[model samples]
Target chain A: SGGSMLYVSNLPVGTSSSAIHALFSAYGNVKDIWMLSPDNSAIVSYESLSSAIVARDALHNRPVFENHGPVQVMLAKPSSNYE
Target chain B: GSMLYVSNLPVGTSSSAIHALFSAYGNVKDIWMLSPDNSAIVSYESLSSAIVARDALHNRPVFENHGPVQVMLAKPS
Candidate 1:
């Protein structure tokens, strides 16, 4: 029971989209990614809700990238809150 | 039997909305929406259903208040 869009936080500043893509693509087809500048958060959308849940369960609180801490993943609210 | 390639989806489009729009043609098996390009692949239960959707929905503003979405048959990769 998850939505297709995910809100990820606690990322390093200037994180590349490709890096994010590579990280999440393992779980499912990433439809789109919107990384908020300076705040170091991103919104990742998957092709299916199941994919989103899988990525969230695996990547949440996990050390995904160097120097950056474990990321927080959750379903986005209002859908357009980040953008 | 076939999948439809849908492109240029407006920002904040949801999978359910995509399903709702495409289902008018027939039964939709699955939907995969891609980011960066803002495109999607809609899987239909039948080829004729997919065909009807491609011709009916393509280059048309199928979504309320949005611009026309590009639709075509998803080529085998």
Candidate 2:
């Protein structure tokens, strides 16, 4: 069975999907990366769970962009789940 | 005052314990324990405070007889 999926948010503005994939791809396989908005306020769906976890454990709450904004990483519930 | 409430919890989860968990990161204005469905609704004085609580507990598993827990920042209804 696959590990799990992780979600990331609070990316820098102007960041691109390819940039995000490249940023995380350094750790491991990147399933997919998408900019949530054109301004790049958020990034989601990087499907390599183990790699995401590793990055998260090392980088969660740490500044990921030059703007000094910390990345927010969390376990994403499937589309069927809600708060 | 600004406040955020958290709910959708398993049975037997103590309101005080949740408060303690959140208090570790920030101040908790108040805590309300609702029964008949097993839930605890907490209020934080500020969004930054609530974010601290959310960051501390959001994805972590919390069990109390029924199942795991879910957390969310309270918004006006």
Candidate 3:
């Protein structure tokens, strides 16, 4: 029902790849991180599909940081024209 | 399984067209083309396969050459 790539939103401002890694890396092997601007969004890819699924099940719509109340996590829809 | 919500398909586009389009990428478990919305939810064998199909065909002009398809995760109502 979900992919290894997750779309994470509602993060605290000034969030970085390392911060995201600090949180998500606990659950699984993080393969890649793409931190987006302004929207406090990021794309996190896990090496293990099962781990990603487990993480989403456990953490979706929950707060990873105290300042950011709650966040949304879902399978990402790729928008880039580049392969 | 991965279920994709595809919207803005060209009018009168046949079911076979969608089947053919998606099958090119991965195995299609099921497809539901809902009327009134002209949208469809097509399930794949796995989430990774669904992602591959979406990445391949999400924005291409496939339906009667009129529209570039709009694709996302299903939020069925």
Chain B, per-candidate TM-score = 0.85, 0.69, 0.82
Tens digits of lDDT, candidate 2, B1-77? 23333445665666566676667766666554544325444545556776666677775566544444555554321
Model 1 global lDDT (CA atoms, 0 to 1):
0.70
| Candidate with the greatest TM-score versus the true structure | 3
Calculate DockQ per candidate and list them.
0.03, 0.03, 0.05
CAPRI rating of model 2: incorrect
- The positional error of residue A45 in candidate 1, measured at the CA in angstroms, is 18
Q: Write the per-residue lDDT of candidate 2 for residues A1-83, one digit (tens) a residue.
A: 12334445577766666666667766777654434343333323344556666866866687877866887755432221111
Top DockQ hit: 3
What docking grade applies to model 3? incorrect
- How much is the lDDT of residue A12 in candidate 1? 76
The TM-score obtained by model 3 is 0.48
- lDDT winner: 1
Task: Give the count of colliding residue pairs in each prediction.
Answer: 3, 0, 0
> Across residues B1-77, which tens digit of lDDT does each residue of candidate 3 receive?
56566667876555567778888877786664544425555667776776788788788877665878976653211
Per-residue alpha-carbon lDDT of candidate 1 for residues B1-77, written as tens digits (9 for 90 to 100): 56666776887688778888888888887665555425665667677887799888889886676799987664322
